């Protein structure tokens, strides 16, 4: 039995029943964690209330919320909505509601489910190519949901407006220079296109000053008809090494997870977004506090 004993793994390597006087080093004993330590923000919760009241903007004027130094409950927010689609990259859908981060970014808009295939970077379309693009580096999540009847205060908009052309007219008036959208940035054309596109296929143009390189900025907004209930899209991005504080889930505040008590013995720690195992000691301050 290879894993029974030290001599057993002695024998299973060397592939033999009569291992010579093979004086190994063998596998080591590792310590077991006698406790657990957790620190995080206390008495502050990430505030999703602005997401609840008012008219949600279009995809190309998505509103952004940035949370640092707070406790969050994403399950509560997703309960209040009828979740249609929920897909994550470099993070798992169960993990995004339970991990600790340094900053959480939640971008929300009004999006009709029909163009679900236009939200991935693959299958470019007009949305991911002119309206909204997520960063390829940090872990991301994408949510499609529908507001229920019982939730009254989200004032439904009048139509689903979204960009189809945002392009720059060079001084030659001959060349058309497309304006691709960069990750986590607004499209360059949001300054001219209004919040709601009045008519499917309308056009807008403005003349750029020489400081901006001259030329013309030309854009066009298309429209998809409303739905019975409003459909919205959420994008979540998380960062890790950016703040000295963290965005963590909420725990139960009656535990013995204090550093000063378990001083000198192996412990699990989740001090902030950073976690591991180790042994703590009282020690003279040495870095930047």
């Amino acid at each position, epitope marked *: 039995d290879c894993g029974f004993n030290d001599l057993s793994q002695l024998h299973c390597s060397y592939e033999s029943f009569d291992v010579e006087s093979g004086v190994y080093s063998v596998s080591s004993f590792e310590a077991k964690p006698s406790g657990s330590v957790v620190e995080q923000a206390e008495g502050v919760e990430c505030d999703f209330s602005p997401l*609840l009241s008012g008219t949600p903007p279009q995809v190309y004027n998505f509103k952004r919320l940035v949370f640092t130094n707070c406790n969050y409950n994403l399950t509560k927010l997703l309960s*209040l909505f009828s979740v249609n689609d929920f897909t994550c990259s470099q993070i798992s859908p169960a993990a995004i509601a339970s991990n600790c981060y340094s900053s959480l970014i939640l971008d929300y808009f009004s999006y009709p489910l029909s163009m679900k295939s236009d939200l991935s970077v693959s299958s470019a379309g007009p949305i991911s190519q002119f309206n909204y693009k997520q960063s390829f580096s940090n872990p991301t999540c994408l949510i499609l949901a529908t507001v229920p009847h*019982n939730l*009254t*205060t989200i004032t439904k908009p009048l139509k689903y407006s979204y960009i189809n052309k945002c392009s720059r007219l060079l001084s030659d008036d001959r060349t058309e220079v497309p304006q691709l959208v960069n990750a986590n940035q607004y499209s360059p054309c949001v300054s001219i296109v209004p919040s709601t596109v009045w008519e499917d296929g309308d056009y807008y143009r403005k003349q750029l000053s020489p400081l901006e390189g001259g030329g013309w900025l030309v854009a066009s907004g298309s429209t998809v008809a409303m739905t019975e209930q409003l459909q919205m899209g959420f994008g979540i991005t998380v960062q890790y090494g950016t703040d000295t504080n963290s965005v963590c889930p909420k725990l139960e505040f009656a535990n013995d997870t204090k550093i000063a008590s378990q001083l000198g013995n192996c412990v699990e720690y989740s001090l902030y977004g950073v976690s591991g195992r180790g042994v703590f000691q009282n020690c003279t301050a040495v870095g930047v506090r």
Partner: nanobody
Amino acid sequence: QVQLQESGGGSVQAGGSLKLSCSVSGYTYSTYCIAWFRQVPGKEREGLAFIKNPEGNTDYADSVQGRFFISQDTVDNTVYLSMNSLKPEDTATYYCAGAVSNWVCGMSIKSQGYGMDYWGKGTQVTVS
């Protein structure tokens, strides 16, 4: 684990003043919001006010704004609801409510409590 209990209900002359109490128990974390509702019989529920606990800030609905006053004892963590100058239209069962989160009560009292998780037994009040 969380228990909400309303008390203090009774009948007073219209144009009087009254005060409820809503004992709250079972919170291990101080980050929550507590709201007051009322239910007129044979109709749908509708909210009146709420208090956000750590911040301490409070808000009221349009209909009873100024007329009502909400507060909370710093040692009992119980919320109140002071009615002044009551009217015949104020006959209903007053409900207490709470939530796991802290930011849902504002949407809640304006959506008849769609977001709440915790409900009290209620307390009927009728004005003569």
